[PDB]
Amino acid sequence: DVQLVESGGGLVQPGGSRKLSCSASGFAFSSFGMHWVRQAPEKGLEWVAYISSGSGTIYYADTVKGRFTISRDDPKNTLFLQMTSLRSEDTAMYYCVRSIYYYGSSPFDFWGQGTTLTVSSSDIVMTQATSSVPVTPGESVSISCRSSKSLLHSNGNTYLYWFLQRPGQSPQLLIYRMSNLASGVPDRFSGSGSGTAFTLTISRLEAEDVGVYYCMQHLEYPLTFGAGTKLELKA
Amino acid sequence: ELDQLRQEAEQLKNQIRDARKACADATLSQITNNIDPVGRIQMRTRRTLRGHLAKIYAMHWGTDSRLLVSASQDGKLIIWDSYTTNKVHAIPLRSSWVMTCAYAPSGNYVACGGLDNICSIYNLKTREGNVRVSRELAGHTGYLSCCRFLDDNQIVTSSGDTTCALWDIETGQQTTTFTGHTGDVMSLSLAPDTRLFVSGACDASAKLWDVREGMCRQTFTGHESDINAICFFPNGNAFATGSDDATCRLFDLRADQELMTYSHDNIICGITSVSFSKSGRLLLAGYDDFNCNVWDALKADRAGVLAGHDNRVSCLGVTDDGMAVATGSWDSFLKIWNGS
Amino acid sequence: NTASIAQARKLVEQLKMEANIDRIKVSKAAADLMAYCEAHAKEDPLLTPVPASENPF
Amino acid sequence: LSAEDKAAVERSKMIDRNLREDGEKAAREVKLLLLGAGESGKSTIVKQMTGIVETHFTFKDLHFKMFDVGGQRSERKKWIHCFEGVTAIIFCVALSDYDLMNRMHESMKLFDSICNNKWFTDTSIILFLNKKDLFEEKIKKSPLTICYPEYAGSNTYEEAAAYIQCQFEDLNKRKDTKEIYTHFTCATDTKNVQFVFDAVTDVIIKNNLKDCGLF
Amino acid sequence: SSLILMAYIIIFLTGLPANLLALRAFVGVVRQPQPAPVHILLLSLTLADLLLLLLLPFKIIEAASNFRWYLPKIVCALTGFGFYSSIYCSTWLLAGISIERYLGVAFPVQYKLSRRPLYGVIAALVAWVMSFGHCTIVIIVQYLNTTEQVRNGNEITCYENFTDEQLDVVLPVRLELCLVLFFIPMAVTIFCYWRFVWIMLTQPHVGAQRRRRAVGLAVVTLLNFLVCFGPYNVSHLVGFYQRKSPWWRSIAVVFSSLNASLDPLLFYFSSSVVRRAFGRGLQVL
Ligand SMILES: Cc1noc(C)c1-c1ccc(C(=O)N2[C@@H](c3ccccc3Cl)SC[C@H]2C(=O)O)cc1
Known part of the structure; x- marks a missing residue:
């Protein structure tokens, strides 16, 4: 463990x-x-x-x-x-x-x-979408992301990481390299993008999927996290 | 009576030979004369991989045509990155006398075996950063010779006890045991459909088995020495056989007889590894003269020589897409060959 | 003894079933091999070299 | 290279350091191969120091590896090239098997093939003629005529044992480059490990001169 | 002086091409897995010999001019510094190889268990520091005492004509170099080879052919050390007693240059016949 x-x-x-x-x-x-x-x-x-x-x-x-x-x-x-x-x-x-x-x-x-x-008292900037998206179970939610510099390297590899931060829990990685799914992550999560514009799509929503979504780039070092998109229940 | 049964065996053999002659209308050499010759093929090494401290005995390509696994007498398995010449993993082995290696189609597991008569299987997708062994397959009396992966749960293993077997991952038991070989078997190749396989034994005979049942569908003879390597044809109803002599034979499953013989007087060394191309037109076979020879699979004419090793070539490999050829030898060096 | 008899009868049964199988002509089998090579010749990097732009070595 | 590409490259270099450290340590260990014929005193010398059994022991701060391949029960020539390059080959031959086709003729045939093997054209052979205690009680009644018919000596142990040792000495044609060491041991003997140390000392000397380019 | 010119080209036309094959072979061994301490010394010896061969054309220019000609002053100081210091560097490197050979037969168990490439690096660096350090100290004092100060490029010793005053300082320096940089390696090399020869001859389990190819090579290597580097450093002792610079120093330098060409030949062992087979095959093609 x-x-x-x-x-x-x-x-x-x-x-x-x-x-x-x-x-x-x-x-x-x-x-x-x-x-x-x-x-x-x-x-x-x-x-x-x-x-x-x-x-x-x-x-x-x-x-x-x-x-x-x-x-x-x-x-x-x-x-x-x-x-x-x-x-x-x-x-x-x-x-x-x-x-x-x-x-x-x-x-x-x-x-x-x-x-x-x-x-008591040159860096790549990752711009995220609106930080307040009301969602309901059973719907599909797409979270946008932007980068100042293209993350597509000469080897055909795009360096993007998606993280889920549950309320009161440590952040958990969901999608790495903009296309792969981390171990233990449900298949409902999908990732796509081209150069600077990226998105993350969830097929089926669940009550345990709420939290704050973060996007980070591992292109150079100097890994800048996104602003953060918060998902809240409509009811 | 044993003498009467022995005499009946010769009668059955004569009937099989008569049937083969009846179905032998022409020869592949006669039909291939009207086709354009392949010509001269020049292959140049691109990436050389170093780090092994002993002779390399086996090497298997992955499904992605990028990851490579090699086994050496130093007791370590190294997962090579062909594109960038990097070591993904280095799996230590409890026994430093291995002679075979395998790569799972999914890449999650790597199998090895040797004189310890144990087919150790290692897990590469562990939660921890180290490679941990998964199951130790025991039950073989002779030395491990070859191992092939059909799926993530079943592995076909051929040993030196003149008996092949099919194992299970969850339970270390022999699901199917193959018997009928009178001599040591030192090679094994799997069909693309993962239903039949051919084993080359020491009695200069190649036997075709079925995984589901376990009996021998067909038997192939013609060689004069122990068969060191075998490889299924891309299509599925043919295979190439290499033995300790200086010749290679191509057998057809439907014809059940030898099709064409590749040999020359200038070669007096055996073949340690036989491989094909993606289209099946090119036949690549290793040799004990520190050279790898490229043969035309349809005309029995040499197309090129891969001479870049100072020691005997022991293993051969062609990627799934056929875009590269990896050659391993006893000089502890791995080379990747490609055209231009 | 009985071991030789058991081995002898097993080989006879093995050879009997192998003989009674369907077989095709060599020319038909040879033509099929040629057809496969010709069809897949265009997608064979070894037989047909690829340019350096598309060659990943 | 990218950020993760550099990390992967550095990881490969770390493995290179580990491989070099393991290779250097393995080069300091002397490898020995045990080739007893039909358990002819093979197990009586292991205690005096599964397919393959590896025995490890240290003498004079030198690590020794002993490999037993008597349980392979397969073709010898299919794996005899894997052990090519060992420091020395330890051969165990019993002396009480002459009375018991013959058990030493199989040993002589097995000795002849390995000694003249291509992969062992220069490896030293350490013959271990054990079970000499039983030779005293057996040669009194049963003579050596049964085993060797071209024998003209008496039944004395001093000359009969030399005859058996001699028959194992002219079985190699490359006498100018390969030397066979012979010793008569027993259960109570305790200098068997010492003889192996001296036998492998000469091999190290030849390897030392090869490294410096003198030979 | 007529035959001095001829000998220099013979060394240059033979020592240089043989050194490149020797350098290529020795470089690979160091880059090969598990290098030995002796291999590093062999690589260092070839580099020192190659450095001597590189400055050989400068010596070819001399002993063949008509006085006169073109020759700079800084070049004389640099050419003599590199040429002569390489002789002393090779002298200590050869003693290092003799030390490794003695420790092999005498202590095979200890040598195998306690050999690392690091020791070969230290042994080479001692030769580099001792040979070059003494010459650099000599060269800086020359200009520090010359009328032109605050520099170390030297303005003397273009043809080694010390007239009547600088002889009081070169001879004490020449004696120090011979007693330190030569006698100490000579004592070690002679003792190590003498002990090695008397050990392998009395070694019981050694083939007759092996002894002949081993004792003979050791004697030849020892003879080369005492012949190539002998007259050059003997003249240092003779000069002090005679209170003058010996006139036969030019001939002695040629003997030292023979070691640079002969050393690859001493390492042209059984692999040479492979080159003959390679050369025979190349002629066929
Ligand atoms: C004069 C004077 N004033 O201060 C000092 C110190 C000296 C002085 C000059 C020369 C020597 C001298 O004999 N050498 C030195 C030298 C090294 C590099 C280049 C040329 C030379 Cl000649 S090392 C070899 C030897 C030689 O080449 O035979 C000794 C002492």
Whole structure:
């Protein structure tokens, strides 16, 4: 059973330091890449940092570059994120997301539970549709998405990822590479697109399918999540 | 009485030979004289794959014509990415004496076997990032020789106990046992319809079996040494047979007799792998002289020589779309050949 | 002993059924092989080389 | 290359490091093949150190791998090329089987084929003439005339054992490049492992000179 | 001096083409799986020999001019620096190969268990540092003491005519190079080959043909070390006693250049007959 537990959250004064620990159990941590994604209260998702399997390849977001440092302990199966010079804009729920070269891509299938963190006081932009779409069971819903730069690479591969965030639950990957379906995802989800315009179609709607949909691009690094589309029951 | 039964066997053999001669009107060489010759075919290596630390004994292509699996004596199975020359996976093996490998049509499983008489099957789509073994098939006395995948639940396995068997994934039991081979069988090829297969044994005989029942529908003879490789024709009612001598024979299921013989005086080495093209016009066969020879499947005339290995070629492979040819040898090197 | 008798009768039954099967002429079988090669010749990268633009190696 | 393409390339390089580490470690282990004929003292030397049985032991900080292929029950020449390149070949021949067509003639025939095999034209052969204790109690009554008819010596163990060893010594035609080591062991013997260490030491010397280009 | 010119071209026309085949063969082995420490030393020796052969045409220009001619001053300093330092680099590299050979027969178990390509890199780098470091220190002091300072390009030693004053500093330096960069490798090479020969001769389980092809090769390699690199460094000791630069140094350099051409031949072992078969087949085509 794959499990990711995050600990090390609490009240932090501005300008202080704190360490976030994400424990990995039930899978090979050494061969799995790791990502840190934070969600501000009542806001969307944004990438923070990523560490490769061999810890020799590390990237950082522009906002948290320099102040934030990430490290991993393969024998202890624990991910570490040491933070310095915490501001009031860092108040968010941090998620540790595993990644691996799977099916020719690097999906984000499993997401951590997350931990609270409150501080008391050239990039491709992905534009989403309206963030308030009233839906009813039994209907078909299409969610649009746009990208400033074409995601179609020279190898014929389009780097698009679709995520579902249930209310009170960690985000779950549904569609990766704009055409493939993640494991455990019902077949009702379909994805299509060409270059910059993308859409996601659901054949049959269910009461458990509500939540907020997010779109992210893995073209360059610099993975910018979408604004977010929220689906709510009409009744 | 055993002597009377033995004499009756010769009478039945004579009747079969008489029937074959009656149906033998002309020869494929006589009918192919009016067709245009293929000519000279030049093949150049494109991607060379390295990383094996021992001789390569088997190599099977995937359904997508992009993923490649190779087995070596070092005890590791490497899943190669042909397009970019990358290692998708490296499956360690408990036994470093394997001589066969297989790729599932769906790509979810990879099978291997060797002198341990166990056909280990590994899962590639695990929740964890590692490749975990799924089932260890036991029950064979002789050494593993070849294994082929019909679906995700059934696998046909030929061993050195002069007996082929069909296994199950969920339960490690022999669903169907094939008996009738008097010698060691070291190769096996499956039909496109996944209903019949041909096994080449050490008694210079090729036997056609049926998966559903298990009896031998037809038997093919003509060779003078042990048959090391066999491959079904694209169409489905023919196959090419290569033995330890320096000749290759093409047999027709409907004719139940040898069609055309590919041989030359300049070759005195056996064939370790036999493969066909997508259209079936090109016959590719490996050899022990560190060379791979391309034969015309209709005219018995050589079209090209694939000489790029410093050791004996042990395995051959052609993709599903026929857009590439992979050749493995004992020099721990894999090469992909294509035209221009 | 009985092992030889059992083996001998099994081979006789195996050979008897193999002999009594339907067979077609060699020329008819040879023509079918030629027809398949000619029909699929245009879609054979090995026999007919493809340009570098469409060649993925 | 794209973002995920670089990650896939890096993953392949990580496997290359693992393959190199495993290959280097495997190159430091001496590979030995056991080819006893009809359990002629084959199991009495394994304890003194399934189709294939692998026995691993360490002597003088050197890792040894012993492979037993007596249970294959298949054609020998279909897999004898897989073991080509081993450090040495360990051969076990009983000495009390002369009285019991003959059990040593099969051993002589089996020894003749492997010793003259193409894949083993330079591999050292370590003959292990065990069961010498039973030879003392058997040669007193039953002589060697039954096994070998062209024997002119007496029934003494000193000269009869040499005759059996000699018959196993002129069975190879490539005497100028391949050497056969012979030893007389028993159940109580404890120096059998030492002899194998000295036998493989010479093979390492030849390999060492080959690597440096001297030979 | 007439025959000095002739010998240089013979080395150049034979050592250079043979080195490229040797370099191509040795480069592949290092890039081949599981390289040996001796193979790295062999590759380094070929590179040092190739460096010597590259500057050979500069030596061909000399000993054949009519005084006179065209020749720069910076080129003289750089050509002499590369040519002579490569001799000392090859001297230490050859001693390294002799060390590996001795450790093979003497300690086959330890050599097999404790061999890594890293040791070959360190052994080569010691030869690179010792040979080039001493020459670089010599070259910088020359210009630091010359009237033109703040540079290291050198303005002396274009034909090695020290008239009456610089002899007080070259001879102590020449003695130091011979005693350090030559005698230390010479002591190791002689001792290692002497022990190796007396070990393989007394080795019980070695074929008669193997011994002849092994002891003979070791003697030839040892003889080449004492003949090619002998007169060049002996003159250093003779110069100090005679208080003058010996006049026969030019002939001694030619002997050192013989090692660059002869070394590929020493490595042209049984694979050579494959080239003869390859050459015979090429002639047929
Ligand atoms: C004069 C003077 N003033 O300070 C120093 C120091 C010197 C001085 C100059 C020359 C030498 C000298 O004999 N060499 C040196 C040299 C290296 C590179 C290029 C040319 C040369 Cl000649 S190493 C080989 C040897 C030679 O080539 O035979 C010694 C000392």
